[PDB]
């Protein structure tokens, strides 16, 4: 595998978004992954609709602004036949009437692939071969809220009890040695003002820190 990967440098990733006061990070993680795969398939980067997922995927197990799961969102896109663009179905950060329109669809999936749970080497293979990957993490910490620079490491982090969906866009290392001071490149949905332009470096191969490889998945397009 490569010593480092950054899909932002290849055109796969949209600008940082902001979920605001709505528990919809699972929807932003899923649109991020679908945006990568649609770009790998077509050459066109198109922002996708988190609101379409928030309002329409209750049957699959999601709860809108009260929580959800990325695999359930990819299940909805498969069963539904499509997903609208952000332009056609804008984000308002509240639960609303499902307004899915097939004529405005710009994405599709046939299902999804799961990364083996707990395996940071399996997550590394998926990021290097596929594109950005949806992942769950434990973000419930003041140290994460106020993150600004450096490789994030928090003793209080759990690898099993998770509460937030994010997007792994790459991995890297500090220094000249590719085998130490490693990190995951993670895109958040708290706006570009949060963190380092909306991103965070999470410690890599430090015993699955904050749960990043516990529940990882990507859409099949």
């Amino acid at each position: 595998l490569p010593k480092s990967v950054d899909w932002r440098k290849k055109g796969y990733v949209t600008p940082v978004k902001n979920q605001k006061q709505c528990g919809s990070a699972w929807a932003f993680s899923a649109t991020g992954a679908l945006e990568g795969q649609m770009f790998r398939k077509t050459g066109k980067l198109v922002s996708l609709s988190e609101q379409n997922l928030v309002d329409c995927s209750r049957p699959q197990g999601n709860q809108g602004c009260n929580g959800g799961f990325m695999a359930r969102a990819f299940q909805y896109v498969k069963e539904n036949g499509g997903l609208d663009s952000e332009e056609s179905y804008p984000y308002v950060a509240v639960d609303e009437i499902c307004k899915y329109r097939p004529e405005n669809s710009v994405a599709q999936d046939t299902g999804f692939t799961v990364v083996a749970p707990g395996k940071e080497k399996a997550l590394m293979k998926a990021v290097a071969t596929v594109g950005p990957i949806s992942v769950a993490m434990d973000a419930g910490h003041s140290s994460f809220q106020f993150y600004k620079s450096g490789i994030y490491f928090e003793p209080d982090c759990s690898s099993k009890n998770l509460d937030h969906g994010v997007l792994v866009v790459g991995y890297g290392f500090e220094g000249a040695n590719s085998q130490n001071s490693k990190y995951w490149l993670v895109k958040n949905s708290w706006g570009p003002e949060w963190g380092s332009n909306g991103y965070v470096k999470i410690a890599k191969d430090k015993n699955n820190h904050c749960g990043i490889a516990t529940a990882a998945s990507y859409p099949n397009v």
Partner: peptide, 5 residues
């Protein structure tokens, strides 16, 4: 999780 801005 939420925290926005």
């Amino acid at each position: 999780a939420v925290a926005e801005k």
